[PDB]
Design a binder for this molecule. Sequence first.
Ligand SMILES: *C1O[C@H](CO)[C@@H](O[C@@H]2O[C@H](CO)[C@@H](O[C@@H]3O[C@H](CO)[C@@H](O)[C@H](O)[C@@H]3O)[C@H](O)[C@H]2NC(C)=O)[C@H](O)[C@H]1NC(C)=O
Ligand SMILES: *C1O[C@H](CO)[C@@H](O[C@@H]2O[C@H](CO)[C@@H](O[C@@H]3O[C@H](CO)[C@@H](O)[C@H](O)[C@@H]3O)[C@H](O)[C@H]2NC(C)=O)[C@H](O)[C@H]1NC(C)=O
Ligand SMILES: *C1O[C@H](CO[C@@H]2O[C@@H](C)[C@@H](O)[C@@H](O)[C@@H]2O)[C@@H](O[C@@H]2O[C@H](CO)[C@@H](O)[C@H](O)[C@H]2NC(C)=O)[C@H](O)[C@H]1NC(C)=O
Ligand SMILES: *C1O[C@H](CO[C@@H]2O[C@@H](C)[C@@H](O)[C@@H](O)[C@@H]2O)[C@@H](O[C@@H]2O[C@H](CO)[C@@H](O)[C@H](O)[C@H]2NC(C)=O)[C@H](O)[C@H]1NC(C)=O
Lengths: 408, 408
Amino acid sequence: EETIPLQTLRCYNDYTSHITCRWADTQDAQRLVNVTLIRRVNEDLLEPVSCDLSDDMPWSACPHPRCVPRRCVIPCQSFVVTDVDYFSFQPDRPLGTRLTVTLTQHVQPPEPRDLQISTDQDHFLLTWSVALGSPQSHWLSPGDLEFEVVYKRLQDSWEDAAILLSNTSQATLGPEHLMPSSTYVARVRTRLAPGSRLSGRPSKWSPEVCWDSQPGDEAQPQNLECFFDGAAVLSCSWEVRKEVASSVSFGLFYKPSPREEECSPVLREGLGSLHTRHHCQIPVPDPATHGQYIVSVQPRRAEKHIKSSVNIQMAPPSLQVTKDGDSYSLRWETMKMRYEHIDHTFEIQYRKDTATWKDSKTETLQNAHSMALPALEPSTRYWARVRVRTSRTGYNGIWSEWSEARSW
Amino acid sequence: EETIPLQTLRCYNDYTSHITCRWADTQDAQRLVNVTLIRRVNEDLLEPVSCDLSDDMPWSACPHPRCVPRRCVIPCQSFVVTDVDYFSFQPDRPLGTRLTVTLTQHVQPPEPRDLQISTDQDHFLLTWSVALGSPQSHWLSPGDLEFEVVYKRLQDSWEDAAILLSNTSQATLGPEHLMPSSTYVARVRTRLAPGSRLSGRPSKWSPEVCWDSQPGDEAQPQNLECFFDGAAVLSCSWEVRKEVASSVSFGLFYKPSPREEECSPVLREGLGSLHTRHHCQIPVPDPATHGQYIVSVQPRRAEKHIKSSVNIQMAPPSLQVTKDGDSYSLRWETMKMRYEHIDHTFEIQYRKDTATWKDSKTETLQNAHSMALPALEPSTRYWARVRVRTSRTGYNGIWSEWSEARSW
Ligand SMILES: *C1O[C@H](CO)[C@@H](O[C@@H]2O[C@H](CO)[C@@H](O[C@@H]3O[C@H](CO)[C@@H](O)[C@H](O)[C@@H]3O)[C@H](O)[C@H]2NC(C)=O)[C@H](O)[C@H]1NC(C)=O
Ligand SMILES: *C1O[C@H](CO)[C@@H](O[C@@H]2O[C@H](CO)[C@@H](O[C@@H]3O[C@H](CO)[C@@H](O)[C@H](O)[C@@H]3O)[C@H](O)[C@H]2NC(C)=O)[C@H](O)[C@H]1NC(C)=O
Ligand SMILES: *C1O[C@H](CO[C@@H]2O[C@@H](C)[C@@H](O)[C@@H](O)[C@@H]2O)[C@@H](O[C@@H]2O[C@H](CO)[C@@H](O)[C@H](O)[C@H]2NC(C)=O)[C@H](O)[C@H]1NC(C)=O
Ligand SMILES: *C1O[C@H](CO[C@@H]2O[C@@H](C)[C@@H](O)[C@@H](O)[C@@H]2O)[C@@H](O[C@@H]2O[C@H](CO)[C@@H](O)[C@H](O)[C@H]2NC(C)=O)[C@H](O)[C@H]1NC(C)=O
């Protein structure tokens, strides 16, 4: 029985005139409350029990960290078969609190249920019911309640609390509330209408209902909330699809009509995965002179500069092998660039129909058109691969594709 | 450059008439937006680039999980030293959002700071400041702001939102707000007073400040919130110290004056360790007839029933050994219970000054007053231990304490 002294309390007696009780108390509770053991004589005869400190706890164990075991001895209660006496623990001082709850001034309406939303062309009718009672209990009538519905998206926190109310168990959520492609969530609480019984906290929020809003254009930026700070900065809370942002880079432009178009910083802050909001701090030195700033969010002119003379890649040359006296040479099909004087480095590769290109000889030289070699008894061995590169101060490019293995 | 296609885009050409570009797109973004590569001719000549799908990505790598590599070929742009052409990516459809912002109607006041609480006899002065600007910026004057302070205890959630307001940067929190021994927490937000500039969301809550409230009586029950449900039940939200509850068991009593005192269920719900709240559902069939219920929370009648004949423990008997002819016997000092006929079982124990009680012989018998034994050459050996128990239908008790070792 929870209470420690009760929990650990065993009273052993002998059919003579000696009944000992052993219980304990927690040393912590001691500095707040102290209790005295009490025996039930017959009824209003709550005769107290004398108890002296003890160190040992044999009859029962104490589940506390620091207990104050006690041993109590009580006199002849004249033992006889079927004799039961009750023990209680009386606190040193009267404890408790009271509260006169005048029903009317402490009413908490029941929570709504059967929350459902039926859409009707970019409009959502949120319906619900409330179990008032059974026999027409005139105490509380539906005309005594008020409803507070809160709604948001399956992303943001309820702290933004976009509330709405109704005197009927129905609300009309539309385009002027929800935004075009977001999945919303809403719940309802039952309040006490001004015409009422009296005060009382409103019910607890009902289960929330989820639904997708009006069809819209995804892959578009949303929530262009811009809030003017004091009198020097204007912060805007951007919002774009975490997939569009990986193909379309957007920027925040602003023009105070009656033009500048970017901010020094555009910090990205990841939202609920599916979305990534951005921020920018637009400076505003003349708030009085220019109190109109039409901000916009469109594709930022993001371009990659490619320098021709640095991103070169020549075409693979031809080879056609020549064999006079002792086969060795290799022809270089230089793609005659119109009288353009540029140095070229080549990479020729050896081989054999019995080996892979990973074990070839790569003689790399400049402005050459052939090389030397000492073959063997094979005359159907592969060994024709040539790469060209810009080995001039026309600084750089990339290895050209390979030529073709002229099986000789 | 962030955008994947831009990030992974290399365009290699040959000083002839063949420039190939290779970029990729993320398969995910594809079902939302599609982009087309574009080359910058000179200015407004944004000539598009044709691109066909590819499977290989050599020139650059794609940091995505599933990419859509593409290979694009573009014609003679007549290559010559110092020739740079820019590439961009154009989305299939115009994307963007606009917002005409009028500073006055979109003002978000700065957040308060230097939040501190000075106590003054069961009163706490909450002070704070607000950085408006530097040179007297008449746009926003302190007489344009309003303050909303919220407070609670270091336990409950802010949803209960016990709000308070002020037209000055100061609030007087007192006994009629806070409760007598709880550690509170409060924060402030800056709103726009009705006399204002215009609409705008208030600032973001400032850092919270924590402080302990007025001194009081701990080890007492608090928050006796009782709320009437519809018209049949009345729930009360109890609250007691998680230390007192282990020595003092409380109950919820109720009497509709102008008596019943307990509920069938008193469910315990652990709070912030230091406290343990309870609940009870008081039934109320006549709300109109009895709209007055004075509830109370005081020490409950928790008693442990101890049945004498079941919690027996006899007294340790004497032994005084007898040695005639051949030492063996042992005397039983039966504490003559006044002509009470009850059966007793005893436990005698052997020993020696050279051994411990864990290796003794325990002959257990009924209504005996001695036993037999064959000693040895020792005459100073310990062996006197006797327990008594109730071996009758006076059902139970506990082994009595031991007797005394009559060293014979
Ligand atoms: C239940 O009874 C116990 C005593 O059996 C109470 O504890 C006792 O509390 C007093 C005052 O709080 C302690 O005495 C003080 O001791 C200091 C020196 O340590 C001295 O400066 C003071 O003048 C005074 O003598 C007393 O020692 C302490 N006893 C024990 C055993 O700790 C306990 O407070 C009672 N419970 C309640 C709720 O009152
Ligand atoms: C960018 O272009 C690609 C195509 O190259 C677009 O994906 C294509 O989308 C259509 C319709 O969403 C897919 O066709 C449909 O296929 C199903 C069978 O799978 C059939 O029932 C339909 O009648 C229709 O033919 C098409 O297969 C798909 N192509 C690929 C390669 O997946 C993509 O949507 C475009 N991006 C945007 C934002 O529009
Ligand atoms: C129940 O609600 C309707 C409609 O809504 C609310 O009315 C105000 C309380 C306002 O603050 C908004 O929340 C809603 O518009 C109430 O009907 C309106 O009553 C006013 C006159 O007081 C009238 O000018 C409007 O045209 C009415 N609107 C409609 C749609 O008929 C109605 O009075 C509420 N019931 C009670 C008992 O207050
Ligand atoms: C600034 O606050 C003081 C005191 O508080 C608020 O007044 C109301 C707005 C009310 O809803 C409560 O929040 C506070 O009491 C305002 O002074 C009170 O003004 C009324 C008359 O309008 C007067 O009867 C009270 O006695 C005044 N209280 C005190 C303590 O002097 C004060 O007007 C507020 N300033 C502005 C510009 O509104």
